[PDB]
Amino acid sequence: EWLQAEIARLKGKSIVPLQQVKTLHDWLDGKRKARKSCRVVGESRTGKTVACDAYRYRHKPQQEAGRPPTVPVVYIRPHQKCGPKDLFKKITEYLKYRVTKGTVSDFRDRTIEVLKGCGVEMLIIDEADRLKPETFADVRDIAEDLGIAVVLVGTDRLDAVIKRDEQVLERFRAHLRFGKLSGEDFKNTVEMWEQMVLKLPVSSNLKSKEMLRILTSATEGYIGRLDEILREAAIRSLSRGLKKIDKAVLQEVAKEY
Amino acid sequence: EWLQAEIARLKGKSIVPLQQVKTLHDWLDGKRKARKSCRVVGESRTGKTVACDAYRYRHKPQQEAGRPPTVPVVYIRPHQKCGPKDLFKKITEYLKYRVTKGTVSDFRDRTIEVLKGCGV
Amino acid sequence: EWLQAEIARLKGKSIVPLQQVKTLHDWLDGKRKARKSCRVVGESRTGKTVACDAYRYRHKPQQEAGRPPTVPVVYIRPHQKCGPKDLFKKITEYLKYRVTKGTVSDFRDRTIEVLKGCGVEMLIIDEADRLKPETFADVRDIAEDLGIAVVLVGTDRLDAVIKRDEQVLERFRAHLRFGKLSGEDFKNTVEMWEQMVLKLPVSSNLKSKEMLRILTSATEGYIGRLDEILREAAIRSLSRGLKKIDKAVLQEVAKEY
Amino acid sequence: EWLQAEIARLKGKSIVPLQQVKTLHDWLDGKRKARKSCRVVGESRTGKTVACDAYRYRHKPQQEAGRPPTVPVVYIRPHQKCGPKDLFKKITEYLKYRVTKGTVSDFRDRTIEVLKGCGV
DNA sequence: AAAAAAAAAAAAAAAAAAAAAAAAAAA
DNA sequence: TTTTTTTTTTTTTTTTTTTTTTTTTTT
Ligand SMILES: Nc1ncnc2c1ncn2[C@@H]1O[C@H](COP(=O)(O)OP(=O)(O)O)[C@@H](O)[C@H]1O
Ligand SMILES: Nc1ncnc2c1ncn2[C@@H]1O[C@H](COP(=O)(O)OP(=O)(O)O)[C@@H](O)[C@H]1O
Ligand SMILES: Nc1ncnc2c1ncn2[C@@H]1O[C@H](COP(=O)(O)OP(=O)(O)O)[C@@H](O)[C@H]1O
Incomplete structure (x- = not known):
């Protein structure tokens, strides 16, 4: 059944x-070369987590020689x-090394x-918001000692916890900001999404003006919300037998979600 | 006594x-297939237990092999x-697994x- | 240097x-489908562990569904x-499962x-001899409790330790034996080697009668010796710029061993 | 590339x-001769760490004699x-001596x- | 503020093998 | 005497639980 292919494609997420x-990505390569730790702060449902994975996938471990493989980028989720122990x-498990049992030292x-x-x-360090306040000392230890650029990808609470420790704030003074979609950028993203993601x-x-306004108001610049609503209404149209999402279909989903 | 049999029936558990x-149930099957988390807010003593039990009755896990059972839905009451430990x-006890000893991690x-x- | 690459290919491991x-392979698959235990007793340098690795390669752990992968063959070398703990x-690590902290029970x-x-x-179980008799109870607990075709790959010491327990003997009574290569069978194996593995x-x-004389005395029917000796003789002849192995080179390899 | 060599030199660290x-250094030498304990207090990113390390490199552990190397200055970063164990x-490891298993005593x-x- | 949940550090108890050396014994 | 043969005798690696103390969190 052809419809099952559309259903299956729409069920899974992707990268656009x-x-x-x-x-x-262009910002991150510079600090990788510069060996200087950084901070990244933005709202949820902005796609910053997707961009982190996309950056990591391009740089992989190289093992031409018989010796250990070189992993240039490490991505972890506390x-x-x-x-600190956890x-x-x-980190130890990410590098395929056996975890010895003992104390924190x-x-x-x-x-x-x-x-x-x-x-x-x-x-x-992905979503450092849930990271314990005590750990920001050991993270800084590693930063200074090993010359490893460290990037903290978190929300607004990050600014709160970082400011309390003067040294931790000194370590990651600079940062990149993630924002929301709006205006022409939002409209272009919506049309490009229909051309790239949706397979209807x-x-x-x-x-068009009659439906893009609904998308603007409902998503509120959150690429995550846009993804959710577009994929959902698009899937729903097909059981009834529609080649395209209708304005009423678009309205029905936003009220529920 | 027949009367006492009827009394035992009257004092027992039943579903209407x-x-x-x-x-x-319709909305919950929708959310289950959609795999979307949601809330359910309302007054108590309105059949919340009945709704949970009657929904759980429809989906029953089957274990034809030694592998873990095909359980579609988990039901817990904190x-x-x-x-977090609780x-x-x-969740571990519901799925018929041994509870590990140790900490929250x-x-x-x-x-x-x-x-x-x-x-x- | 092309000669270097041609030489390097021979130092490689291969299965014939x-x-x-x-x-x-057929015998073990029969026991596997029957879910019954059996034993393996052969003299050293007979490649029975190579055959076990090949049998393991034949069956590929499939991951059709999200539910735990269906690994049908387990291969542990004590x-x-x-x-009991090791x-x-x-067993736990082989199935790519986390080894938690806790007691032995x-x-x-x-x-x-x-x-x-x-x-x-x-x-x-390759190298079944190197195990403790107080671990045989755990191994046999697997055979009694679950329908598992537990296989014990071992040498003569395996027989010696197994007979000391009637229950283990009865559970693992079925077995397979190995022989050696002699006469025309050895010559057939030698030519098969020359055509399948020799990269000259x-x-x-x-x-030939002369090379077979040297090889029969040097290998004594053991396939591992044949493999090692022929690879080394090919390299020794390559070092002199030849396209094939001279008779004197083969004799030299025999003398060194 | 010559330019890359100069850039790498700039990327490295040097002591001024x-x-x-x-x-x-004068203060620390006076204290060492008097064997009087003291402290050093200052703000972060002021470089006092490097100055203390530089004092360490002034005099090293002479080992010319037949007896063990004599270390006048020990420097550790806890x-x-x-x-009270680490x-x-x-200290023991900084003096190139083995670590024995045991208690804090x-x-x-x-x-x-x-x-x-x-x-x- | 003032009870309740969480990582180091000491301290006690128990088999299961293995080797070596000596002493006695038997034709 | 040569060897056997045992027989003691003496000398050696893994496993587990239980307090205390202390520092952070919450309420
Ligand atoms: N480029 C993209 N392609 C597809 N989905 C995206 C993209 N960017 C964001 N998303 C959606 O956003 C969600 C992840 O965003 P999130 O993890 O919240 O990032 P952040 O933590 O920076 O807000 C996913 O559900 C994903 O579907
Ligand atoms: N059929 C075979 N295919 C490949 N190599 C073999 C074969 N038979 C014997 N060998 C050789 O035996 C050597 C290893 O034998 P090994 O794995 O120790 O088996 P086993 O332990 O039974 O002797 C390898 O060097 C290999 O070249
Ligand atoms: N005497 C010095 N010469 C050169 N650079 C220095 C000096 N002191 C400090 N620095 C700079 O400061 C860093 C080391 O000082 P640091 O250890 O941070 O001092 P503190 O720990 O007291 O803040 C180096 O990166 C270096 O660039």
């Missing part, structure tokens, strides 16, 4: 090239209230060893 | 389906002042493992 | 189909003086739990 | 002499929240021993 993503364990020695062995040009047989002219 | 239950423990890993095995 | 290998831990149940999610009809552009005629 | 460093361990005795043997 955007100006914001390329901006972040859990809620993640402590944070070190995550032992884990620290193990982590420094495995980080020195590989290249590690950049270390990324007939274009609904979502860039 | 309501329009609230059917409406919620205790008063429930912490959420993890209740260990419980978290254990819970994700058991959740990943089944459909959930 | 043989009569004994073909027998082993060390020296292995206890055995259980190797909990450790024993971790492996039992991970085994059910995957098929794991046949567990194959010109035939060395290793089935 | 300042009056603040000379003042610190990690975050280091207790400190002793770091054992580490304490071992540390006093290695501190008495060398000048320190």
